[PDB]
Design an enzyme around this catalytic site. Structure first.
Site, PDB file in Angstrom:
ATOM      1  N   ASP B   7       0.841  -1.190   0.000  1.00  0.00           N
ATOM      2  CA  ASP B   7       0.000   0.000   0.000  1.00  0.00           C
ATOM      3  C   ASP B   7       0.878   1.241   0.000  1.00  0.00           C
ATOM      4  OD1 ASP B   7      -2.591   1.487   0.340  1.00  0.00           O
ATOM      5  OD2 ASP B   7      -1.770   1.889   2.304  1.00  0.00           O
ATOM      6  N   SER B   8       0.277   2.383  -0.310  1.00  0.00           N
ATOM      7  CA  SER B   8       0.985   3.664  -0.220  1.00  0.00           C
ATOM      8  C   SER B   8       1.384   4.027   1.226  1.00  0.00           C
ATOM      9  CB  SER B   8       0.140   4.778  -0.846  1.00  0.00           C
ATOM     10  OG  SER B   8      -1.115   4.903  -0.161  1.00  0.00           O
ATOM     11  N   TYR B  39      -0.640   8.574  -2.960  1.00  0.00           N
ATOM     12  CA  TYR B  39      -0.515   8.316  -4.385  1.00  0.00           C
ATOM     13  C   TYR B  39      -1.695   8.963  -5.100  1.00  0.00           C
ATOM     14  CZ  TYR B  39       2.939   4.473  -3.700  1.00  0.00           C
ATOM     15  OH  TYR B  39       4.016   3.696  -3.411  1.00  0.00           O
ATOM     16  N   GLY B  40      -2.855   9.039  -4.433  1.00  0.00           N
ATOM     17  CA  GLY B  40      -4.108   9.541  -5.044  1.00  0.00           C
ATOM     18  C   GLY B  40      -4.149  10.927  -5.689  1.00  0.00           C
ATOM     19  N   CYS B  70      -3.704  -1.050  -2.180  1.00  0.00           N
ATOM     20  CA  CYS B  70      -4.009   0.338  -2.571  1.00  0.00           C
ATOM     21  C   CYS B  70      -4.945   0.363  -3.790  1.00  0.00           C
ATOM     22  CB  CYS B  70      -2.696   1.074  -2.898  1.00  0.00           C
ATOM     23  SG  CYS B  70      -2.936   2.839  -3.307  1.00  0.00           S
ATOM     24  N   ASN B  71      -6.100   1.017  -3.673  1.00  0.00           N
ATOM     25  CA  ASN B  71      -6.952   1.189  -4.852  1.00  0.00           C
ATOM     26  C   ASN B  71      -6.333   2.078  -5.952  1.00  0.00           C
ATOM     27  OD1 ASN B  71      -8.674   0.846  -2.284  1.00  0.00           O
ATOM     28  ND2 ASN B  71     -10.128   0.217  -3.914  1.00  0.00           N
ATOM     29  N   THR B  72      -5.559   3.072  -5.542  1.00  0.00           N
ATOM     30  CA  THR B  72      -4.877   3.982  -6.464  1.00  0.00           C
ATOM     31  C   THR B  72      -3.804   3.212  -7.228  1.00  0.00           C
ATOM     32  OG1 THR B  72      -5.360   6.022  -5.176  1.00  0.00           O
ATOM     33  CG2 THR B  72      -3.508   6.129  -6.712  1.00  0.00           C
ATOM     34  N   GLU B 150      -6.929  10.058   7.901  1.00  0.00           N
ATOM     35  CA  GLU B 150      -5.549  10.017   8.424  1.00  0.00           C
ATOM     36  C   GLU B 150      -5.414  10.737   9.750  1.00  0.00           C
ATOM     37  OE1 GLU B 150      -2.286   8.963   7.231  1.00  0.00           O
ATOM     38  OE2 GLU B 150      -3.143   7.877   5.545  1.00  0.00           O
ATOM     39  N   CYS B 181     -11.308   3.061  -2.069  1.00  0.00           N
ATOM     40  CA  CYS B 181     -10.108   3.636  -1.429  1.00  0.00           C
ATOM     41  C   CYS B 181      -9.917   2.892  -0.115  1.00  0.00           C
ATOM     42  CB  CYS B 181     -10.330   5.120  -1.128  1.00  0.00           C
ATOM     43  SG  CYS B 181      -8.939   5.951  -0.336  1.00  0.00           S
ATOM     44  N   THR B 182      -8.664   2.588   0.214  1.00  0.00           N
ATOM     45  CA  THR B 182      -8.295   1.921   1.462  1.00  0.00           C
ATOM     46  C   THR B 182      -8.877   2.586   2.715  1.00  0.00           C
ATOM     47  OG1 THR B 182      -6.215   3.194   1.375  1.00  0.00           O
ATOM     48  CG2 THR B 182      -6.091   0.861   0.725  1.00  0.00           C
ATOM     49  N   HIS B 183      -9.005   3.914   2.690  1.00  0.00           N
ATOM     50  CA  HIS B 183      -9.382   4.662   3.888  1.00  0.00           C
ATOM     51  C   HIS B 183     -10.868   4.594   4.177  1.00  0.00           C
ATOM     52  CE1 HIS B 183      -5.304   5.822   3.412  1.00  0.00           C
ATOM     53  NE2 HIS B 183      -5.313   6.780   4.319  1.00  0.00           N
TER      54      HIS B 183
HETATM   55  O1  LIG Z   1      -5.673  16.917  -2.608  1.00  0.00           O
HETATM   56  C1  LIG Z   1      -5.596  16.771  -1.195  1.00  0.00           C
HETATM   57  C2  LIG Z   1      -5.650  15.321  -0.672  1.00  0.00           C
HETATM   58  N1  LIG Z   1      -4.323  15.496  -0.019  1.00  0.00           N
HETATM   59  C3  LIG Z   1      -3.556  14.745   0.848  1.00  0.00           C
HETATM   60  N2  LIG Z   1      -4.028  13.632   1.361  1.00  0.00           N
HETATM   61  C4  LIG Z   1      -3.317  12.778   2.196  1.00  0.00           C
HETATM   62  C5  LIG Z   1      -3.410  11.409   1.990  1.00  0.00           C
HETATM   63  C6  LIG Z   1      -2.687  10.471   2.710  1.00  0.00           C
HETATM   64  C7  LIG Z   1      -1.810  10.865   3.701  1.00  0.00           C
HETATM   65  C8  LIG Z   1      -1.691  12.231   3.924  1.00  0.00           C
HETATM   66  C9  LIG Z   1      -2.422  13.195   3.177  1.00  0.00           C
HETATM   67  C10 LIG Z   1      -2.344  14.634   3.519  1.00  0.00           C
HETATM   68  C11 LIG Z   1      -2.566  14.945   4.950  1.00  0.00           C
HETATM   69  C12 LIG Z   1      -3.003  13.932   5.817  1.00  0.00           C
HETATM   70  C13 LIG Z   1      -3.246  14.208   7.157  1.00  0.00           C
HETATM   71  C14 LIG Z   1      -3.084  15.500   7.638  1.00  0.00           C
HETATM   72  C15 LIG Z   1      -2.695  16.516   6.781  1.00  0.00           C
HETATM   73  C16 LIG Z   1      -2.441  16.246   5.445  1.00  0.00           C
HETATM   74  N3  LIG Z   1      -2.276  15.595   2.681  1.00  0.00           N
HETATM   75  C17 LIG Z   1      -2.173  15.200   1.267  1.00  0.00           C
HETATM   76  C18 LIG Z   1      -1.475  16.329   0.579  1.00  0.00           C
HETATM   77  C19 LIG Z   1      -1.062  16.432  -0.684  1.00  0.00           C
HETATM   78  C20 LIG Z   1      -0.379  17.610  -0.946  1.00  0.00           C
HETATM   79  C21 LIG Z   1      -0.232  18.421   0.100  1.00  0.00           C
HETATM   80  S1  LIG Z   1      -0.990  17.720   1.523  1.00  0.00           S
HETATM   81  C22 LIG Z   1      -4.160  16.798  -0.695  1.00  0.00           C
HETATM   82  N1  LIG Z   2      -4.173   3.783  -0.529  1.00  0.00           N
HETATM   83  C1  LIG Z   2      -4.850   4.861  -1.332  1.00  0.00           C
HETATM   84  C2  LIG Z   2      -5.268   6.061  -0.471  1.00  0.00           C
HETATM   85  C3  LIG Z   2      -4.069   6.897   0.033  1.00  0.00           C
HETATM   86  C4  LIG Z   2      -3.275   7.462  -1.153  1.00  0.00           C
HETATM   87  O1  LIG Z   2      -3.782   8.377  -1.842  1.00  0.00           O
HETATM   88  O2  LIG Z   2      -2.144   7.006  -1.417  1.00  0.00           O
HETATM   89  C5  LIG Z   2      -6.040   4.321  -2.084  1.00  0.00           C
HETATM   90  O3  LIG Z   2      -6.552   3.242  -1.735  1.00  0.00           O
HETATM   91  O4  LIG Z   2      -6.549   4.981  -3.012  1.00  0.00           O
END
Ligand SMILES: OC1CN(C2=Nc3ccccc3C(c3ccccc3)=N[C@@H]2c2cccs2)C1
Ligand SMILES: N[C@H](CCC(=O)O)C(=O)O
Ligand SMILES: N[C@H](CCC(=O)O)C(=O)O
Lengths: 255, 254
Positions: B7-8, B39-40, B70-72, B150, B181-183
């Site tokens: 997974d990511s 990765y998404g 990971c779905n992505t 998260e 999506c995993t989450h």
């Molecule tokens: O499109 C938006 C979706 N996204 C993000 N989602 C995720 C996904 C998995 C793990 C961390 C993050 C965080 C994040 C997670 C917890 C707390 C704060 C941030 N920010 C990124 C980011 C991507 C680029 C900048 S931040 C940007």
């Molecule tokens: N594991 C990813 C979610 C977190 C990511 O964006 O990497 C998915 O299932 O799409």
């Protein structure tokens, strides 16, 4: 003068906007590590290594100075990077402390530091402020502001609710708010609006913008360069899709 | 049987949870690319390269099967990974199609796919569903659910507002919602509750869980009985700090 600007992604464009207005540098090499953003959610060991790998990127570019536009990389990796660099490396934390000293006369003024989890966990701001005699410092990792801003959620109910989520538990109303993250300038007016609306303040707390503070520092370190550049050459590089990164410059730079 | 799970980051723990419950495998090597998550939000070429590099990671582990939790990565990288792998690689998209085939008799049943931006833009779900005759497919990148989850924001006003943000413009009420999506399993009940509340439903839509669908697939494909280790050997690996990763596992597996 040729320089580099390093960030985890497109957030660094808020520093670039400030740099461009200062007209200091003839050539700017921008590198955003957009394959590995965000840095703020990750650990000191990982971010340190990311910072050293950024140094490797800039080697062939023969830059004279490296700006670490990222507040997270500044907090966690700057010291390690400076250890292994011959050129000066300037981050966005120390220049903000200097800006505070110029703008905040009262050592008891309540200051609130906003940043990523990693930035806030480091206590980089708190330590530096305490070292300068500031006695009334609060910090808050407003982590979700970053993804909201990446998604262009810059107004409306979702942004308001997110701000309310983080700000509601605040024990002290700030007189000064440090925007200790590249992304936060994009919601500065909304942050000002939150405090004015919720606390019936006729004007908002003073906001410290990391890009303006680093520019103010550089304007005096490289004073001969003020207004030197009629129009700069800028190279955009990314570890992710570089078109994706460059495309975002228009919005962030107000082109 | 020794398998790998990729997974990511920590999201794959929702698949790991399904896997452990099903008792299929004696040994599991979990790898979360937590230095580079998410990765998404990134592009197909970058995601494909991430998938290829994940193969390097598993090489010395001599696994018999790689699960892409990971779905992505499943939507973008699976085909490329399979091209460079001598072992079977199974992702989370195709098993969910098979679950829908089993559970959704009406080819015109309104299905809503939720996923990251990359997953949704790939149309991996839409394409696979159309291939099986499904005619009424909607998709929505509910990107911000990932960071909320998260941060353990699994209730309250922030989550409700975020769901409203994404769900209000919907013109078709889904009969089936794919948790692409995993989450998303971590807010499944809140999603169910949103549709019941806002659309006045006695029963929520059917939710398709990626972990549960892949378990069903794997049992059939490998003719497995639910009789491997109750407590298999599990290793945790990460590109970021592995202590941070395992700390979260403890929370997601509970
Ligand atoms: O499109 C938006 C979706 N996204 C993000 N989602 C995720 C996904 C998995 C793990 C961390 C993050 C965080 C994040 C997670 C917890 C707390 C704060 C941030 N920010 C990124 C980011 C991507 C680029 C900048 S931040 C940007
Ligand atoms: N594991 C990813 C979610 C977190 C990511 O964006 O990497 C998915 O299932 O799409
Ligand atoms: N550039 C980061 C924000 C995005 C990230 O977490 O990498 C900072 O200034 O803290």
């Amino acid at each position: 003068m040729k320089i580099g600007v390093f960030d985890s992604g497109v957030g660094g464009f808020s520093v670039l906007k400030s740099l461009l207005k200062a007209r200091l540098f003839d050539e700017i090499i921008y590198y955003g590590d957009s394959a590995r953003v965000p840095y703020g959610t990750k650990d000191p060991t990982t971010i340190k290594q990311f910072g050293l790998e950024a140094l490797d990127f800039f080697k062939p570019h023969e830059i004279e100075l490296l700006i670490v536009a990222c507040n997270t990389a500044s907090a966690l990796a700057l010291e390690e990077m400076q250890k292994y660099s011959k050129i000066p490396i300037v981050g966005v934390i120390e220049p903000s402390i200097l800006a505070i000293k110029r703008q905040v006369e009262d050592k008891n003024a309540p200051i609130l530091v906003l940043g990523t989890k990693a930035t806030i966990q480091s206590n980089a701001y708190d330590n530096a402020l305490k070292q300068q005699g500031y006695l009334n410092i609060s910090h808050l990792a407003t982590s979700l502001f970053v993804p909201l801003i990446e998604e262009s959620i810059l107004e409306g109910e979702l942004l308001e609710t997110c701000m309310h989520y983080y700000f509601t538990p605040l024990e002290i109303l700030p007189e000064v708010i440090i925007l200790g993250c590249t992304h936060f300038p994009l919601i500065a007016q909304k942050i000002e609006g939150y405090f004015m609306g919720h606390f019936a303040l006729p004007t908002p707390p003073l906001l410290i913008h990391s890009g303006d503070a680093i520019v103010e520092y550089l304007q005096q370190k490289y004073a001969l360069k003020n207004n030197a550049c009629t129009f700069p050459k800028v190279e955009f590089h990314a570890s992710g899709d570089v078109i994706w990164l460059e495309r975002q410059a228009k919005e962030w730079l107000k082109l």
